[PDB]
Each structure stands twice: as C-alpha cells, then as structure tokens.
Amino acid sequence: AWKGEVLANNEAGQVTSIIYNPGDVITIVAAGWASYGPTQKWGPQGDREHPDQGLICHDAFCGALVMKIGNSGTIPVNTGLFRWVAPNNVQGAITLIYNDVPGTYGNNSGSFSVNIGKDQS
Amino acid sequence: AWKGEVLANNEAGQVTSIIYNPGDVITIVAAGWASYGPTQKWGPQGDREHPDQGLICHDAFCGALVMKIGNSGTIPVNTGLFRWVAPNNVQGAITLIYNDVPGTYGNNSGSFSVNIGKDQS
Amino acid sequence: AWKGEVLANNEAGQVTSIIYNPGDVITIVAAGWASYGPTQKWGPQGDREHPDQGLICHDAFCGALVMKIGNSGTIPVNTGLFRWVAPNNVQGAITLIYNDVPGTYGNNSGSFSVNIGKDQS
Amino acid sequence: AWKGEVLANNEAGQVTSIIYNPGDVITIVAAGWASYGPTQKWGPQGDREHPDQGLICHDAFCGALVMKIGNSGTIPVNTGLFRWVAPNNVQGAITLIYNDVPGTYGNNSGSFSVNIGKDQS
Numbered sequence: 001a002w003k004g005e006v007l008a009n010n011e012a013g014q015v016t017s018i019i020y021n022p023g024d025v026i027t028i029v030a031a032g033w034a035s036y037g038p039t040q041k042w043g044p045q046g047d048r049e050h051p052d053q054g055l056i057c058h059d060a061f062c063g064a065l066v067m068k069i070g071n072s073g074t075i076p077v078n079t080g081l082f083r084w085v086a087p088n089n090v091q092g093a094i095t096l097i098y099n100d101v102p103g104t105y106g107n108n109s110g111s112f113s114v115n116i117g118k119d120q121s
Numbered sequence: 122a123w124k125g126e127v128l129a130n131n132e133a134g135q136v137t138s139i140i141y142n143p144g145d146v147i148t149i150v151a152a153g154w155a156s157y158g159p160t161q162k163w164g165p166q167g168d169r170e171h172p173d174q175g176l177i178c179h180d181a182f183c184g185a186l187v188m189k190i191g192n193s194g195t196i197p198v199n200t201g202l203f204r205w206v207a208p209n210n211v212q213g214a215i216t217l218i219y220n221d222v223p224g225t226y227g228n229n230s231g232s233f234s235v236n237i238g239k240d241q242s
Numbered sequence: 243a244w245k246g247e248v249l250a251n252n253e254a255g256q257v258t259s260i261i262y263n264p265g266d267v268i269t270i271v272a273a274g275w276a277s278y279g280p281t282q283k284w285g286p287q288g289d290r291e292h293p294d295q296g297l298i299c300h301d302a303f304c305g306a307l308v309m310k311i312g313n314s315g316t317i318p319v320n321t322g323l324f325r326w327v328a329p330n331n332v333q334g335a336i337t338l339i340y341n342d343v344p345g346t347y348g349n350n351s352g353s354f355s356v357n358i359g360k361d362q363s
Numbered sequence: 364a365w366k367g368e369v370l371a372n373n374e375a376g377q378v379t380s381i382i383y384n385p386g387d388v389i390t391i392v393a394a395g396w397a398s399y400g401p402t403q404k405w406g407p408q409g410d411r412e413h414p415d416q417g418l419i420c421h422d423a424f425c426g427a428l429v430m431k432i433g434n435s436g437t438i439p440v441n442t443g444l445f446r447w448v449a450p451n452n453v454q455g456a457i458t459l460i461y462n463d464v465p466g467t468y469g470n471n472s473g474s475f476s477v478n479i480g481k482d483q484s
C-alpha cells in the first residue's frame with residue numbers, strides 16, 4: 001500500500017510507489033482541503049462552480065484530485081476509487097496531481113492525504 | 122460488498138447489508154454532492170465553515186457522511202475509511218447518515234454514493 | 243490471519259483465533275506429513291486406501307485435516323479451501339482436527355502447518 | 364483469479380492467466396490425486412518415498428505440483444502458497460507442472476485442481 005500527501009501548488013504532482021499493471025484492482029481514498037486561489041478550500045472533488053479555463057483534466061472540477069498511470073492522460077480520482085480496474089492499455093507508476101490550469105498553480109494552497117492499495121483479484 | 126445511495130434528506134439514515142464483526146477490516150469510499158439547505162453542494166467531508174447547531178455527529182462537519190455500527194454513537198466516514206478497524210466492542214449493522222441537525226433534514230438535497238467492502242485480514 | 247501446527251495426536255483439535263461469521267470468505271492452506279499409526283506418513287488429504295473404522299469425519303480420508311465451525315459437524319479441509327463460504331447458519335470459532343477414530347489418537351505422529359485468513363468480500 | 368486442472372501426463376504443463384508482477388502477493392490452493400506411473404496415487408506434495416531419477420524440480424518430491432514464473436527455475440507449490448511473494452523478484456506468466464522425469468509423462472494419470480489469486484498488498 002502507499003500513503004502520502006499531494007500539494008495543490010505542485011504542478012508536476014507526486015509519484016507514488018504503486019506500479020499499476022494490467023488486471024490490477026486498486027482502491028484509493030483521498031481526504032483533506034485545498035484551494036486553487038480563493039480563501040475557501042474544497043475537498044478532493046474540487047469546486048463544482050468554477051469554469052474550465054484549460055484544466056489538465058476536463059472530466060473533473062477545478063481543485064479535484066486526478067492521476068496519471070505511467071504516461072497516460074489525466075484520470076479523475078476525486079474522493080477515490082473502490083476496487084477499480086483501469087482501461088485496457090494503461091500501465092505504470094501512479095502520479096497524483098491537483099486539477100488546475102497549467103501555469104496557475106503558484107497561488108494554490110493546502111493538500112490531500114491519499115491512501116492507495118492493490119486489492120484481491 | 123454493499124453499494125448504494127445515502128440521501129441527504131433521509132434523517133433515519135440508510136441501513137446497509139454490512140454487519141461489522143470484531144476484527145473486521147473494512148474500506149468505505151463515498152462520492153457525490155449534497156446540501157443541508159443551500160444551492161451550493163458539498164462533498165462527503167461537508168462544509169468546514171458551518172457552525173455546529175446540534176449535529177448528530179459533533180466530530181464531523183455539517184453535511185459530512187457519518188455512520189453508526191450497531192449500538193455505537195455516530196462515527197465520521199467523510200470521503201471514506203481505508204482498511205479501517207472499529208474501536209473495541211463496536212459491532213453490528215452499518216447505517217450511513219448525512220450529518221445535519223435533527224428536525225432540519227426536510228430542506229436537504231442530493232446524495233452520496235457509498236461502497237463498503239470487507240478487506241483481507 | 244492465523245498460523246499454527248495441528249498435531250495428529252491432538253484428539254481435542256487446535257482452537258484457532260478465527261471466528262467464522264455469516265458471509266465471511268476464508269482461505270486455508272495446509273501442508274506437511276502425519277500418520278494415524280503406521281511408519282508411513284500422508285499429507286492433508288490423508289490415506290485414500292484406509293477404510294473408515296469410525297472417523298470423526300466420514301467425508302474425508304483417515305489422516306485428512308478437517309475442521310468444525312463453532313459446534314458444526316466436521317467439515318473436510320484437506321489441502322485447504324480457496325475463498326470459501328460456509329453453509330447457511332454455520333458460524334463460530336474454527337477448530338482444526340486430524341481425522342482419526344476417537345480413542346485412537348495416542349499412536350499418531352507428525353503435524354500439519356496451517357494458515358487461515360479472511361478474504362476480501 | 365485462475366481456476367484450472369494440471370494433468371499429471373502433460374509434460375509441457377498448464378500456462379495460467381496469472382502474470383506474476385513485482386510486489387504481487389498470491390495464494391494457490393491445489394487438491395486432488397495423481398500418479399507418475401503406479402496404480403497408487405499421491406496428493407500435491409507427491410511421493411515422499413520416491414527417489415529423484417531426474418525430476419524437473421529437484422526440491423520437491425516426485426508427483427508434486429511445481430510452477431515456473433516467467434524465466435524462473437521450477438518452484439515447489441505442493442498443497443499451495445498462502446499470501447506468498449516470489450523470491451528473487453521473478454515475474455511473468457505462471458505455468459503449473461506435475462513433477463516427473465522428462466520423457467516419462469506418458470504413463471501418468473490423474474490431475475490436481477488448482478486455484479490461484481492475487482491478494483491485497
């Protein structure tokens with residue numbers, strides 16, 4: 001299993017120790033509070049109201065937790081994933097990233113605490 | 122495992138099929154958008170700015186997901202629990218409940234989608 | 243999980259710390275060599291050529307590993323059980339026992355090494 | 364999980380669907396009766412009394428269940444493996460094989476029923 005923190009102001013995201021292999025079943029639970037700029041903070045699903053001005057993940061809200069598996073496109077995580085299997089032809093290290101617009105991470109604050117483990121399959 | 126919806130306006134809570142037994146390790150993942158009255162909706166950690174006006178769980182924000190296990194008090198769930206073991210002598214059916222003040226559930230809207238499973242132990 | 247030895251000469255059986263509860267999925271792996279009397283030894287499926295002369299479990303060979311769950315009748319374990327669920331209304335502490343004739347355990351020797359764990363469900 | 368049979372007379376062995384990857388925890392349960400030639404049959408630990416006349420696996424008895432992981436040598440499985448991590452960081456497809464002398468599989472009979480799964484990690 002892997003446990004760690006993803007900072008909202010880290011545009012590169014945090015690589016985890018989890019290498020996703022074909023057929024792996026994984027669980028993710030994310031918690032905590034972060035902001036893309038405003039004084040209000042949001043949970044790992046982000047801010048439902050905020051328009052999309054070029055987010056790294058168009059399938060999630062601004063301020064949501066997303067991931068890459070190896071060199072994949074962004075995948076929404078939000079609060080987490082329950083005994084989840086990735087699409088065909090996605091494999092490699094899981095990287096966790098705060099969903100914001102490239103070049104706009106400098107005014108971000110807070111972080112999410114994340115647990116990931118592989119499940120029985 | 123158990124999957125289902127926990128309506129924010131459901132004061133009695135949602136009874137699951139899960140009986141928590143001594144030594145059980147469980148995982149809960151909760152997702153979605155709910156409100157205790159306003160247009161704005163919050164995720165399963167609730168509204169970190171809202172005062173406690175007599176919440177059924179004083180250890181979680183207004184609009185958080187909480188649970189009872191048998192004869193237990195309310196226990197915070199928020200976004201979920203990763204490979205979690207209950208306190209000593211806590212056992213019985215899991216009921217999930219939206220965290221609001223008794224008598225104030227009628228103006229609530231939306232729901233959380235919740236997955237509960239027992240893990241390897 | 244539980245790990246230990248089940249001696250062939252133990253008529254009372256080996257009490258494990260594992261309480262089987264309704265809906266539990268369990269895995270048992272058993273290994274090793276034991277005898278009901280002769281100088282030869284058999285594995286956990288016992289001696290397929292020995293007649294049943296009053297075995298505690300008529301559904302397993304003499305020198306097989308069997309079990310009770312609470313005060314159930316004996317249930318064959320043999321080499322083990324993979325992600326196994328008990329019949330309805332069977333619950334309680336797992337006792338592991340060597341399959342022999344009551345009052346004839348005294349000339350037995352050797353032991354099986356046994357692992358039990360609860361699986362994701 | 365993979366569920367199959369290993370025929371005692373199959374010299375090439377049974378390729379499974381299981382790809383063992385680094386960090387994987389696996390459980391195997393093997394059951395049944397098989398012969399390397401004689402009328403008698405043995406369980407998955409094989410015949411403890413038989414010499415090694417050129418077995419494919421030199422640290423398991425004649426008539427035992429053994430496996431290869433990718434490019435590994437033969438690894439003893441016997442009655443099975445409980446939440447087991449492969450030594451030497453081996454990886455690749457699991458092949459199951461009955462332990463007999465190469466060129467002598469023609470007179471074998473019976474089969475082992477085998478279940479393999481990946482476990483929580």
Ligand SMILES: N#Cc1cccc(O)c1O
Pocket residue numbers: 157158171172174183221222225226228
């Ligand atoms: N907490 C709270 C609360 C206070 C007033 C009215 C409501 O509907 C509420 O949910």
Ligand SMILES: N#Cc1cccc(O)c1O
Pocket residue numbers: 399400414416425463464467468470
């Ligand atoms: N071990 C062995 C062996 C030796 C001779 C003939 C066989 O069929 C065997 O299986």
Ligand SMILES: [Ca+2]
Pocket residue numbers: 036037100104105106107108
């Ligand atoms: Ca920003």
Ligand SMILES: [Ca+2]
Pocket residue numbers: 156157158221225226227228229
């Ligand atoms: Ca309300």
Ligand SMILES: [Ca+2]
Pocket residue numbers: 277278279342346347348349350
């Ligand atoms: Ca005896």
Ligand SMILES: [Ca+2]
Pocket residue numbers: 399400463464467468469470471
């Ligand atoms: Ca042969």
